[model samples]
Target: MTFKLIINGKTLKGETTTEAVDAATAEKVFKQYANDNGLDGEWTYDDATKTFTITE
Candidate 1:
């Protein structure tokens, strides 16, 4: 999948991996956005389905 992001007026690109990554780890990888881009939410790691969700 593809996504569009901007940082310091520069467009940034990223790619996702099919290999499973932990939610907390994924959050850590993007913590910059979480701090700078108003990213506030909850993330739960389902042992059964291994999925993540941003609760409303």
Candidate 2:
């Protein structure tokens, strides 16, 4: 997997392990997932977990 994102407690994956990253990349993917899920607010990034979290 490319990256893991936690949006409103939901886990979202970026791309397949088969794709090459290109930040204009997975950035929007997470944003849209959050928006679509009605999640909008502050974001917390956990480097240790390699995941992004959003709490609203």
Candidate 3:
């Protein structure tokens, strides 16, 4: 399955640039994205939607 990392209502990366990735790849990318963006929160994955969300 593929997953995406979104920040706020927009994608962390560009819409077309943020390539769909596997769960493992998605986790690592999301972590780096959060760290780079100074996001301090828990990461949640919605299997049904294949999306990751950050919550404080």
Model 1 scores worst on lDDT over the 10 consecutive residues at: 1-10
Off by over 4 Å in 2: 9-24, 46-49
Rank ordering of all candidates by TM-score, starting from the highest: 3, 2, 1
The C-alpha lDDT values of all candidates are: 0.42, 0.54, 0.59
Off by over 4 Å in 3: 9-17
User: lDDT per residue, candidate 2, 1-56, as tens digits?
Assistant: 47655445434433222111733355566676667867577876565775555566
Measured with C-alpha atoms, the lDDT of residue 44 in candidate 1 is 49
Question: Model 3 — TM-score against the truth?
Answer: 0.56
lDDT of 1 at 29: 56
Q: Give candidate 2's error at residue 24 in angstroms.
A: 5.4
lDDT of 3 by residue, 1-56 (tens): 55556554333433221344567676776676667867656667777876766655
Clashes in model 3: which pairs?
none
Score every model by TM-score.
Answer: 0.42, 0.50, 0.56
